[PDB]
Design a protein around this ligand. Structure first.
Ligand SMILES: [Cu+2]
Ligand SMILES: [Cu+2]
Ligand code: NA
Ligand code: NA
Ligand code: NA
Ligand code: NA
Lengths: 620, 620
């Protein structure tokens, strides 16, 4: 009955039927995106209407469409033709990936380039990459992918070990034309293999690791109701899944005595960009918007018990649409479990004689996605003490190139002749805040150093200052680790027992933001990534920091255009957008498969409760 | 047989006998510090000599002594009388703590102050705190403690809830004289209790938490030999224990094929300071050097199975000396165990068809100490992939004051009338490096942004720069989170298979350093805490960043005096000193007992290995 329930296979089948009957899903059409729309603000009328948003691509070159459907009523609500030269192309389709390699295999220029390198075309894999927007006027309004080549010596070989540098091609995937083949010169193809399951590379496997057995003899402490509603240790939330964003958390609330207190209305990773920092023309266009261009949810892994998720695991299997509107289940795509998390609180008191220890735990909600060579884990954590944390885990195989003789300022060497270009992995968390309700504000908190003198005669005092962000034009903020800068989201109309506004503090990791020149194409298309924190006034249609149609969009859409409205955010329905990421200079230890590295953020209560919220945790 | 073995009870008993026979341990003497000396450089002669360093206090006012003893030979090696007005006082003795409250109970000024507040002297606990060095000329060369008062309503009451503000006393603990009683005015004593085991405060305990059972059916994967030598998943190290520093790690090495490769010769937390930022004269002198003044090892907790350490736990019970030279065992003072640590590496490859997942784990070595109201956990972690990490966990009860009517810029309000002064908790990690041997150097690595233009026509390139620190005078460095600053410790004479020097990268958390005015007493005594990174040339006698005798030492000793030697550190035997800490603005949720907060650092391999070191981890 809950409006936040996961999409069912029956809903998706109904959407397909509604589109087909309306004449919108002929044999030339493909569904590039399908997802449920969240309820609009003020849904306290119970008048549920399950609506789906659909992007429809046409493989014959006709204009694509954006369509909204009500499965409750069985009707098309609206259908708009899209001018993609203006508003951006649709996300890349899984079926377009294979088109690139097949088209290049019959192009005379491509074959001549491979022949010069004595490579068998049957052994050459082509990575199909998003194109971005650069200097090529003929690409405006066309669906382009760019291809980079790797050699696979045999069917089980890791092609990433054998990049074909000096060569790139551009492909129009609708007209099925190779527009350009660029050959800047022959580089040796690195010859060492990177097969991390080959015994010749691994050596004998270790026999020293003894089992760690994690079990829950009475079952887990959380309950799942209505398919996706979780209650755990005073937390309450709904676990959503969207094919673009992946796991989405709704209605995060905490049961404080007899009050269910809201904290976050919607939390998601709303974009993630991977920009490459190699100025070679073979790769200087390379920027992945994994969320906006590729849709990270549709490549979610099925997670295996004992290997991917260890312990007493509860799975969710979300349903998405394939390109024809058929429902597809991602079996065991989301893992949920609780974990011991060390000591929560401890004190041995000399005067009272009381020794006190309590243990912490966290609830984990995670999924893993694979986009070509990279694999990303998305982890949401809820702690007993009210802390909320996100962590991204980056692994997989690094993207490779030749390593030039005489070295490089922009590429690491991993093996003889094998390079890995510098790059970043940058995420945008969209936090639609609801601290004790929807009237919220953001304050920036800095440490304040004080000078020795009157009133501070021993020169020991220090303080802090808080600055309220009152309008969107002043709500674009940068980190300052040296001054301990954090941001507090508070509710000025809801006070704790000390008559202070209740709040939550955002703690960032203070990693570098986007490094590209501010005049670059990527800085314009990924403007969100140039600043650590943005605050906007909530609006139904302001969903992504990069806009709705990211693929081949010329720039400026999303957050820079939203904040130009300069709306009041002082005690209003607000959304916090936090940029955070990893700057990756690959090391030898990242090859041939990369150990996990992590980045994230957390929010901790700041006078939200009237005292510690974990006094009622038992001794265990 | 190993020279790095823990001190035995028999060794300590022999030290006592040697001191007694030499006439150095009469009834007026107290042992303020006793610990084993590490082998000197070049101990490859097997000529083992177990030597102990002893600080001997005299309760009659005679000069204290520093003594070195050889238990192997049964001799006093050297004995030096100390001029404490010059070189500092000895660490505080546990037995001096009770002297303060007892002496004040008979002082007419103290009793008049308590009578004005209608407090029963039998209910007034006095926190005995280190004195530092301020404006009081009569304290030079005397052993002073300062006392702050708290009311205990009944024997099991938490006195911290009832600070007696406006009152402080200074006590000469040798002459047993109260030198000064300062009463700046009557503040109401906060009346709410803070008894976190009282059902009236906790409410009914939760019944919702189901058990998490962590077991190892075949036992743990590590072995312990010689009492304290650990081998685990290619790591090798010795776990030491010192009464001042606590757990010390020796001879950290990694088995790479058939070579045992050193990484760190000695790792320890060599100082930790807690400066308070309240300018009230009642507290503006308040700075704890928990390591140098109090000795954190002697207050180590006995850790309980299932509560403090969960899983298959191996304990060490270190032995220390009491004040009379008798051995005292800290039963179950160190916990050692391995922990599952999520996913290590993962890739699902479209082209090869191979799906690959491996799980990570870490070895944990920890102890917990209690100093008055605060409790600190010290955690060392070793990971499968070569990462080394330290984490401090801060909990206990925050130090309190009155909350002034009309508020404060330097104190948080926790409850009606109850304040908590702002403060920091700052640690110094001393890392005596040995990356593939002792010829090491430090490079500072910054991200480099590049301008769009020739050679970078699309404005996407970025790079990095490394600066070698060649002399101690240029080796005092500050963090810069915005430029992604890290430090690399490398061995220029040991190269990986790509002909690059092997190295390890230090990743800091980039938290604020010491906030006090640079002209303050604490900035002079804790100079190490004003900068994030120091590099010195190894020397036997340069052990602590604050010097040997921290208590009431006027300042300048330790790191600032060491680096004035301006020694060569470019490919030499070097020591890295890393400052890191927490800046604590207490929140309501920290009261009445504080949930754990954490800070730390980590070191990751940087071309130390020829490829990923965890290819031989099995599928599990
Ligand atoms: Cu990367
Ligand atoms: Cu603190
Ligand atoms: Na446009
Ligand atoms: Na909001
Ligand atoms: Na002095
Ligand atoms: Na060294």
């Amino acid at each position: 009955a809950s409006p936040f329930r996961l999409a069912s296979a029956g809903e998706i089948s109904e959407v397909q039927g509604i589109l087909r009957t309306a004449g919108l899903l002929g044999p030339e059409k493909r569904i590039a995106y399908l997802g449920v729309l969240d309820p609009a603000r003020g849904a306290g009328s119970e008048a549920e209407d399950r609506r789906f948003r659909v992007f429809i691509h046409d493989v014959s070159g006709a204009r694509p469409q954006e369509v909204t459907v009500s499965v409750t009523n069985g009707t098309v609500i609206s259908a708009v033709e899209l001018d993609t030269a203006a508003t951006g192309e649709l996300p890349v389709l899984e079926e377009e990936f294979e088109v690139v390699e097949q088209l290049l295999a019959t192009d005379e220029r491509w074959l001549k380039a491979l022949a010069a390198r004595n490579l068998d075309v049957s052994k050459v894999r082509v990575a199909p990459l998003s194109a971005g927007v650069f200097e090529y006027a003929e690409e405006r309004g066309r669906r382009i992918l760019r291809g980079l080549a790797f050699v696979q010596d045999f069917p089980e070989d890791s092609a990433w070990a054998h990049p074909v540098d000096g060569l790139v091609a551009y492909v129009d995937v609708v007209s099925k034309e190779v527009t350009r083949v660029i050959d800047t010169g022959v580089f040796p193809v690195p010859a060492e293999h990177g097969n991390y399951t080959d015994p010749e590379l691994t050596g004998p496997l270790r026999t020293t690791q003894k089992p760690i057995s994690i079990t829950q003899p009475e079952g887990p402490s959380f309950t799942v109701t209505g398919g996706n509603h979780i209650e755990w240790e005073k937390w309450s939330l709904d676990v959503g899944f969207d094919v673009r964003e992946g796991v989405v958390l709704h209605n995060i609330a905490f049961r404080d005595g007899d009050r269910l207190r809201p904290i976050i209305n919607r939390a998601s990773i709303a974009e993630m960009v991977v920009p490459y920092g190699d100025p070679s023309p073979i790769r200087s266009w390379q920027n992945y918007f994994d969320t906006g261009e590729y849709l990270v949810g549709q490549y979610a892994n099925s997670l295996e018990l004992g290997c991917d998720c260890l312990g007493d695991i509860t799975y969710l299997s979300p349903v998405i649409s394939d390109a024809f509107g058929n429902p597809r289940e991602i079996r065991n795509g989301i893992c949920m479990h609780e974990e011991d998390w060390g000591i929560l609180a401890k004190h041995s008191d000399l005067w009272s004689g009381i020794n006190y220890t309590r243990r912490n735990r966290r609830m984990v909600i995670s999924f893993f996605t694979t986009i070509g060579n990279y694999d990303y884990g998305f982890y949401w954590y809820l702690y007993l003490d009210g802390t909320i944390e996100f962590e991204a885990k980056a692994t997989g195989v690094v993207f490779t190139s030749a390593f030039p003789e005489g070295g490089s300022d922009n590429i690491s060497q991993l093996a003889p002749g094998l390079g890995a270009p510098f790059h970043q992995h940058i995420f945008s968390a969209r936090l639609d805040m609801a601290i004790d309700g929807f009237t919220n504000r953001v304050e920036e908190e800095d440490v304040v150093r004080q000078t020795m003198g009157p009133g501070n005669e021993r020169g020991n005092a220090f303080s802090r200052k808080r600055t309220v962000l009152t309008r969107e034009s002043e709500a674009v903020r940068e980190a300052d680790a040296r001054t301990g800068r954090t941001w507090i989201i508070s509710n000025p109309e809801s006070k704790n027992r000390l008559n202070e506004p209740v709040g939550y503090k955002l703690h960032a990791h203070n990693q570098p933001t986007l490094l590209a020149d501010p005049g670059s194409s990527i800085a314009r298309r990924a403007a969100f990534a140039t600043k650590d924190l943005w605050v906007t006034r909530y609006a139904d249609d302001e969903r992504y920091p990069t806009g709705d149609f990211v693929n081949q969009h010329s720039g400026g859409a999303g957050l820079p255009s939203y904040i130009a409205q300069d709306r009041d955010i002082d005690g209003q329905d607000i959304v916090v957008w936090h940029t955070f990421g990893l700057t990756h200079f690959p090391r030898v230890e990242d090859w041939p498969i990369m150990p996990v590295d992590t980045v994230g953020f957390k929010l901790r209560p700041e006078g939200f409760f009237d005292r510690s919220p974990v006094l009622d945790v038992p001794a265990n």
